[PDB]
Each structure stands twice: as structure tokens, then as C-alpha cells.
Amino acid sequence: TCPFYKKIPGTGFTVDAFQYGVVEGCTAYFLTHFHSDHYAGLSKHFTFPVYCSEITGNLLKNKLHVQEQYIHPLPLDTECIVNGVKVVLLDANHCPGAVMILFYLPNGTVILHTGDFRADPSMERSLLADQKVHMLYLDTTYCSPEYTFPSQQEVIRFAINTAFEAVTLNPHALVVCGTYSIGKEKVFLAIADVLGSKVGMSQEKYKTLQCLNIPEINSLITTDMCSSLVHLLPMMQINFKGLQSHLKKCGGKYNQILAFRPTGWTHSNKFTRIADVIPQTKGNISIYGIPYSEHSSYLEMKRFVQWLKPQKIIPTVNVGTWKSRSTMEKYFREWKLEAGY
Numbered sequence: 222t223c224p225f226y227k228k229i230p231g232t233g234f235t236v237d238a239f240q241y242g243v244v245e246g247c248t249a250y251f252l253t254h255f256h257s258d259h260y261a262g263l264s265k266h267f268t269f270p271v272y273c274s275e276i277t278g279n280l281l282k283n284k285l286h287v288q289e290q291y292i293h294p295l296p297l298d299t300e301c302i303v304n305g306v307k308v309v310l311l312d313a314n315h316c317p318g319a320v321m322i323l324f325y326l327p328n329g330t331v332i333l334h335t336g337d338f339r340a341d342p343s344m345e346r347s348l349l350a351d352q353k354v355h356m357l358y359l360d361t362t363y364c365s366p367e368y369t370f371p372s373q374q375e376v377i378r379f380a381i382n383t384a385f386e387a388v389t390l391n392p393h394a395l396v397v398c399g400t401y402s403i404g405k406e407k408v409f410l411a412i413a414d415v416l417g418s419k420v421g422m423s424q425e426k427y428k429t430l431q432c433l434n435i436p437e438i439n440s441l442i443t444t445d446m447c448s449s450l451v452h453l454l455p456m457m458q459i460n461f462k463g464l465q466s467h468l469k470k471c472g473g474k475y476n477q478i479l480a481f482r483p484t485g486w487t488h489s490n491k492f493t494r495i496a497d498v499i500p501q502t503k504g505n506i507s508i509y510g511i512p513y514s515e516h517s518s519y520l521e522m523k524r525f526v527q528w529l530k531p532q533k534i535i536p537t538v539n540v541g542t543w544k545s546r547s548t549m550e551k552y553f554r555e556w557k558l559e560a561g562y
């Protein structure tokens with residue numbers, strides 16, 4: 222049974238609600254982004270209208286085989302009427318094709334559903350500037366002040382400088398980057414660009430990337446692993462055992478691995494600056510965990526909510542414990558008392 226925080230009142234709509242069977246009253250199912258916790262339950266046998274971005278709809282058609290007649294792609298930043306209700310999709314600054322959804326209810330209520338997002342001051346000049354929001358369905362993944370991490374640009378600067386140094390010292394080093402979903406593509410694309418290489422990967426991963434409308438992608442990626450000095454591997458293989466095994470397969474072309482694991486936040490963020498990050502090393506293998514987030518930090522979240530001034534907040538993450546819920550509610554009230562709304 223579908224939980225309340227996935228339903229949009231006053232409509233026939235649900236958000237990210239595909240794992241509950243046929244939801245009573247639902248005439249259109251919205252999908253914010255192509256991450257498995259959110260698409261859980263979609264497959265080629267789905268027969269109700271799915272509304273989403275163009276990129277999400279490429280992934281549904283080619284990776285999940287959803288039939289074309291049930292996929293309804295909407296342009297961004299454009300007022301659209303769906304089953305008699307005005308909606309807008311906005312870029313969520315999450316993974317490729319991820320959106321926030323603005324719903325203009327027939328009674329005058331305005332609802333923003335963030336999906337998953339990384340709040341940014343650029344959102345203060347989208348179509349959100351123009352009107353009041355009554356209800357905010359909020360991605361609360363990192364809603365506590367201990368959750369700090371650097372900008373994506375500082376993280377990428379670290380990665381490119383680390384990779385370029387290592388490979389200039391040893392031209393026979395291979396770089397490997399872990400992946401298990403879409404998102405975070407700038408990590409491996411920025412490192413390959415500084416090294417003058419295409420990125421090499423499995424046919425399954427190449428297929429996924431080919432759905433993402435990235436400019437000039439054919440110039441940036443390949444399935445010919447032998448021609449590439451930046452490889453992608455599943456995240457589960459980014460360990461000393463799995464990397465040893467990979468280095469054997471490369472036919473003595475390489476004699477060292479430098480590997481990256483983009484994580485979200487880890488507790489080493491509560492002590493160490495990005496500049497001071499060091500790898501774990503065993504012989505000719507080194508592994509860097511880098512804090513590349515596609516979710517809001519606490520400060521970024523707070524800034525966004527204090528600017529938007531919603532009347533009511535409904536969290537969509539960390540909802541399963543009373544301690545989490547109470548924590549989140551306390552910070553919402555602080556934010557409102559501090560800013561005066």
C-alpha cells in the first residue's frame with residue numbers, strides 16, 4: 222500500500238510509486254528520476270501513463286522496455302496540462318534527467334515535489350521565483366548539521382589533479398572509476414579529458430550512457446577497453462581483490478592502478494578537508510574515496526527552504542524512525558523562527 226507522502230491531494234497523481242500495484246484513484250504516475258529505489262516496480266508489462274523527463278523516458282524505453290505508448294515525456298521549464306492540472310518540471314541538480322515537479326491544484330494550492338535534489342542558489346531564479354508554494358515534499362537525505370561536504374567543482378579539481386599527477390609520473394598506470402547507477406558522470410569524464418583518453422566500459426553501461434543526451438558523447442566513451450586508459454567498473458569491484466583481478470586481464474599493458482569511489486558523505490568528512498584526502502594503498506593499487514554528492518548539504522537545504530518559505534514541509538527521506546522525524550521537525554521550526562515566516 223502506497224504511503225501518504227507519495228500522493229498529491231486533489232489530484233489523480235502519485236510520485237515515485239510503482240511498487241504498490243495498481244494505486245486506487247491514480248490516473249497518472251510521475252517518475253522524478255531513474256534510480257532504482259524510485260522506479261522499483263516498473264517493467265515492460267506496465268500499462269498506465271508515466272510522466273517524466275525526456276532522458277528518463279529514454280531510459281524507461283531502452284533499459285526497462287516500457288512500451289512507448291505509456292511513456293509521456295515533458296519538456297523542462299514549460300507549463301503543461303496533465304489530466305486537467307497545470308504542472309511544470311524543473312531541473313533537480315541530481316543525476317541526468319532528474320526533475321522537481323510543481324503542481325498547480327484546481328483549488329489554488331501550489332505544491333513543489335523536489336524528488337531527489339541538490340539545492341542551489343540558481344533555483345531562486347527559476348520559475349519558482351514567480352509564486353507562492355503552500356506544500357513542499359522535500360528530499361531530506363542529509364537534514365542534520367553534521368552533513369558537510371565540498372562543492373562538486375572542488376571535488377572534480379582534486380580528482381583531475383590527482384589522476385594527471387599519477388599518470389604523468391607513471392605512463393603505465395591505469396585509472397579505474399566505480400559506478401552502480403546513473404549520476405556522477407563528471408568524475409570519469411573530467412579525468413578522461415585531462416588524460417586525453419576515451420572512457421572504456423561494458424556494453425550494458427555504454428547503452429545507459431547513450432540514453433543521457435550528453436553533448437558529443439560519441440567522442441568521450443567506448444566499449445574498446447584496449448584503446449582507453451580510464452576504465453569503469455561496477456562499484457562492488459572497487460577493492461584490492463577486484464582491482465588485482467582486473468589488472469591481470471589487461472595483458473601487461475599496465476603495472477599500477479589508481480581507483481576512485483565516489484561516495485556520498487562519509488564520517489571522514491567530519492575531520493578531513495578535501496585537499497588533505499589520502500588513499501588506501503596495497504602494493505601497486507591505491508583507492509580514493511571522494512565525497513561527490515548529488516544531494517543537498519544541510520546548509521544548502523536550509524538556504525533553499527528559508528528562501529522558498531513554504532507553509533508546510535513533508536519529508537520524503539529518513540521517514541521510518543521516530544528519532545529521525547523528531548530531528549527533522551525541530552530543524553524546520555528553527556529555520557522558520559530564524560527567518561520569520
Ligand code: NI
Binds near residue numbers: 254337
Ligand atoms: Ni536518487
